[PDB]
């Protein structure tokens, strides 16, 4: 039961949906973050629950649902990490694990070229802003993948090359951008 | 940040002491074990504490001093690992880390004789010391007449009744938490 991978957007909010199977009576629930604890929760049927925030900082931007799912708002980079819900029953203490990732939304996708004759050879590079190591590019023509990197170099002959355009697609877990360029324009 | 290495003996107990306040005041304490939480403690300076244990695995085995120091009794191998105390002040949550290693007592020490079969009065002995199960952590040393003659299992001596006196070669095995000692006599081994 390895960690559920969830993606938060920098600046915005996110919920880690604490769930079951259960069956036995929950006595407590603890929300853990990395080495540390975030929140202690004594659930109650009749009453509101007693909630104890054990981690000052994060805690400012921290709330809980009717079901004790973690709600984290105005997400920061230092928010990334392993979150875990420990449902302390009377004979067991099972863990739900999440991996929270925080990424800026991709913006400003751009394409530049670097160079006649009858046969045209283009050197294309796709760039983006607010990238990370976990961005990923690919160049596509007619639904075919010419390249899986920001760099594409291809030959284009107006009179036998079947495609007429090249399209860069840049995406991460929360962004999907694309720019396309015209051989017939990039080759004079 | 350290953490503080602690040696528990299998089947015995061990506490883990806390350090505060040095200034701030604690609203709660959380004792953590590896991936999980063990206990939430809500102290009352003015009264008694509210101790919600969050991991029942540790049965009657888990306990807390008047000082909210964690104490585990009848330790098992499964207790090995990291314990952290999260002391929640208003403005932060500092951790006292511990790493608890569970060692077993040494049982059954043995000396074995790898000498030559027939002894020629000018007697030469190759002995070697053992413990029931060898661990990287076990340390041997031999002693005779107040002199330490080795710092490993093996011992080579020589002995001649005509000039050397009667004495016992004594192995001593030990690890962090315990020790044993067996002692053969030269007169016996050499005949
Ligand atoms: Ca709420």
Question: Are B112 and B191 part of one and the same domain?
Answer: yes
Question: Are A161 and A132 part of one and the same domain?
Answer: yes
End-of-domain residue from the set A81, A104, A127 = A104
Resolution of the coordinates in A? 3.0
Question: Are A89 and A134 part of one and the same domain?
Answer: no
Buried b (16+ CB within 10 A) or exposed e, A109-141: bebeeeeeeeebebebbbebeebeeeeebbbbb
End-of-domain residue from the set A104, A139, A160 = A104
User: Where are any strands of DSSP class E within chain A?
Assistant: 4-9, 14-16, 28-33, 36-42, 50-53, 62-64, 70-72, 81-88, 93-103, 107-113, 120-129, 136-141, 144-147, 151-156, 165-172, 175-182
Interface residues from chain B to A (CB-CB < 8 Å): 27-28, 30, 32, 35-37, 40, 42, 52-57, 84, 86, 88-93, 95
Give residues after which chain B gaps, C-N over 2.5 angstroms. Answer: none
Task: Please tell me what DSSP assigns to residue B145.
Answer: T
**Across the interface, which of A57, A86, A91 has its CB nearest the CB of B54?**
A86
Give the pair of three-digit tokens for residue B99.
Answer: 């790493």
Q: The domain spanning residue B92 has which CATH number?
A: 2.60.40.10
Number of domains forming the structure of chain B: 2
B36-42 β-sheet, strand order:
B4-9, B93-103, B81-88, B28-33, B36-42, B50-53
Please list all protein residues whose beta carbon sits less than 5 angstroms from ligand 1, which is an ion: A 63
Deposited experimental method: X-ray
Question: Are B5 and B96 part of one and the same domain?
Answer: yes
Question: Are B129 and B149 part of one and the same domain?
Answer: yes
Please tell me the number of Cα atoms within 13 Å of A89 on its side-chain side.
Answer: 11
Question: Are A91 and A144 part of one and the same domain?
Answer: no
Question: Are A1 and A93 part of one and the same domain?
Answer: yes
Q: What's the angle, vertex CA B7, arms to CA B6 and CA B8, rounded to 5?
A: 120
Query: Which strand (E) or helix (H) includes residue A56?
Result: helix A56-59
Range of the domain at A169: 105-188
Question: Are A119 and A76 part of one and the same domain?
Answer: no
Question: Are B109 and B191 part of one and the same domain?
Answer: yes
Question: Are A115 and A79 part of one and the same domain?
Answer: no
Give the pair of three-digit tokens for residue B69.
Answer: 């120091």
Interface residues from chain A to B (CB-CB < 8 Å): 27-28, 30, 32, 35-37, 40, 42, 52, 54-57, 84, 86, 88-93, 95
Question: Are A59 and A148 part of one and the same domain?
Answer: no
Which residues of chain A does B33 touch, with a Cβ-Cβ cutoff of 8 Å? none
Whole-angstrom CA distances from B174 to B12, B95, B126, B179 are 18, 33, 21, 4
């Amino acid at each position: 039961l390895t960690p559920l991978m969830v993606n938060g957007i920098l600046g915005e909010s996110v919920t880690l949906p604490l769930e079951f199977p259960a069956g036995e009576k929950v006595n407590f629930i603890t929300w853990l973050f990395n080495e540390t604890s975030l929140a202690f929760i004594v659930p109650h049927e009749t009453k509101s629950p007693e909630i104890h925030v054990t981690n000052p900082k994060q805690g400012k931007r921290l709330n809980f649902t009717q079901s004790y799912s973690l709600q984290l708002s105005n997400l920061k980079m230092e928010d990334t990490g392993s979150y875990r819900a420990q449902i302390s029953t009377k004979t067991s203490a099972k863990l739900s694990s999440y991996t929270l990732r925080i990424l800026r939304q991709l913006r400003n996708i751009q394409v530049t070229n670097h160079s006649q004759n009858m046969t045209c050879e283009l050197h294309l590079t796709c760039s983006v802003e607010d990238a990370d190591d976990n961005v990923s590019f690919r160049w596509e023509a007619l639904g075919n993948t010419l390249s899986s990197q920001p760099n594409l170099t291809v030959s284009w002959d107006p009179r036998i090359s079947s495609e007429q355009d090249y399209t860069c697609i840049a995406e991460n877990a929360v962004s999907n951008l694309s720019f396309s360029v015209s051989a017939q324009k990039l080759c004079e």
